[PDB]
């Protein structure tokens, strides 16, 4: 219940019973997905090569 190295920023975590999405993101098991096919180029008429 302490630290093994100097830079141990995580502690062992535990809970009981019904598990929420809040319980899963706090144990770092929920992350937003990247839509890799989705890419946005901002619309403009570029005139730098003019």
């Amino acid at each position: 219940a302490g630290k093994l190295g100097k830079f141990q920023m995580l502690g062992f975590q535990h809970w009981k019973g019904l598990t929420s999405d809040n319980h899963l993101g706090a144990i770092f098991q929920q992350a937003p997905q990247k839509a890799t096919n989705l890419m946005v180029q901002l619309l403009a008429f570029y005139r730098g090569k003019s």
Binding site: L10, G11, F12, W15, P32
Partner: protein, 333 residues
């Protein structure tokens, strides 16, 4: 940390009381709102980005509403007074090796099987009094347990004299024999200490221990050397790190469940609890049931957290505003 829930738990910070919706100007404000026919209670709170409200409590459907102080959520650091057994020998026997083991039980992981053993030792000599023993074994324990190289704080050890009898003189791994100058030391006190805490990632957790003694040869038998009794605690870990880790969890209920997962792309929720202040906690635990054949209940709880100044000024004014508005008899703490 991660807590258990009775199907939900949502937390609101009561930094101030404004008594109507139009006075919500700074963040952290709270207004206990209800109607005249006391059927609905809710809390309009000023978030860091606008006015927000809570779920509308049906006042026939509350189960309990009891508020706890900040003195009831403070972990008391356990003490152990290590002395010489006068039945074995009142003075140290002039030849033996006097060894004391500290049996830690929640070293780095959660279980009682992740143990750790630290030691102090004194070779007793002729003419050594009982006070010069405790001067020499609090030095030996401090070089092992309060060293500068250890990854975690393990125990705080102190010496108590027979003249003072209450005041602790702290002995560290840098403390010398010439600093501890008293001929009336009568015990050694080994006290738990507070472990480090990182907000939401490393919870508040403690390493318990047990001072254990080895056997010295007195006459012809190996008698255990000493006796250790639990002394009533004098130091408590304050409430701030438990509540700051309690806002941080219950903020994910009304918000983003991933707090920092994937970091160019996070939604920085701003928290209102100071980790360096003590807080009072009020829990209204209610449910929902409809007028139909679906008569089962969906239990819910709403936590309100206000600062404690020692006389509970902010929470009792928060409790009293709920009592007039909603007609609930929350007990003044």
């Amino acid at each position: 940390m991660v807590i258990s829930i009775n199907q939900v738990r949502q937390l609101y910070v009561a930094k101030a009381l404004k008594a109507n919706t139009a006075a919500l100007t700074t963040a952290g404000d709270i207004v206990p709102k209800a109607d005249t026919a006391k059927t609905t209670l809710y809390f309009q709170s000023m978030s860091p980005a606008g006015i927000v409200a809570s779920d509308k409590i049906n006042l026939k459907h509350v189960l309990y509403a009891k508020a706890t102080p900040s003195e009831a959520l403070a972990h008391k650091l356990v003490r152990y007074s290590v002395t010489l057994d006068a039945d074995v020998s009142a003075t140290p026997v002039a030849g033996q090796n006097y060894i004391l083991r500290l049996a830690f039980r929640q070293y780095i992981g959660l279980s009682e099987e992740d143990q750790y053993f630290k030691y102090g030792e004194v070779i007793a000599r002729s003419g050594m009094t009982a006070s010069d023993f405790y001067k020499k074994m609090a030095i030996s324990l401090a070089k092992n347990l309060e060293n500068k190289t250890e990854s975690t704080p393990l125990v705080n050890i102190y010496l108590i004299s027979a003249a003072a009898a209450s005041t602790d003189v702290p002995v560290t791994s840098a403390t010398k024999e010439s600093d501890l100058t008293a001929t009336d030391y009568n015990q050694i006190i080994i006290e738990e200490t507070e472990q480090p805490w990182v907000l939401g990632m490393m919870p508040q957790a403690f390493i318990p221990f047990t001072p254990q003694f080895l056997t010295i040869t007195v006459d012809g038998e190996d008698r255990l050397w000493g006796v250790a009794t639990v002394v009533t605690p004098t130091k408590t870990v304050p409430d701030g790190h438990l509540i700051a880790d309690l806002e941080y969890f219950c903020m994910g209920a009304r918000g983003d469940i991933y707090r920092g997962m994937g970091y160019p792309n996070i939604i920085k929720t701003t928290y209102l609890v100071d980790p360096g202040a003590v807080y009072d906690v009020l829990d209204i635990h209610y449910f929902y049931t409809g007028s139909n054949e679906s008569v089962q209940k969906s239990e819910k709880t709403i936590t309100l957290v206000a600062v404690d100044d020692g006389s509970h000024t902010a929470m009792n004014a928060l409790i009293g505003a709920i009592n007039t508005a909603s007609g609930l008899t929350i007990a003044t703490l």
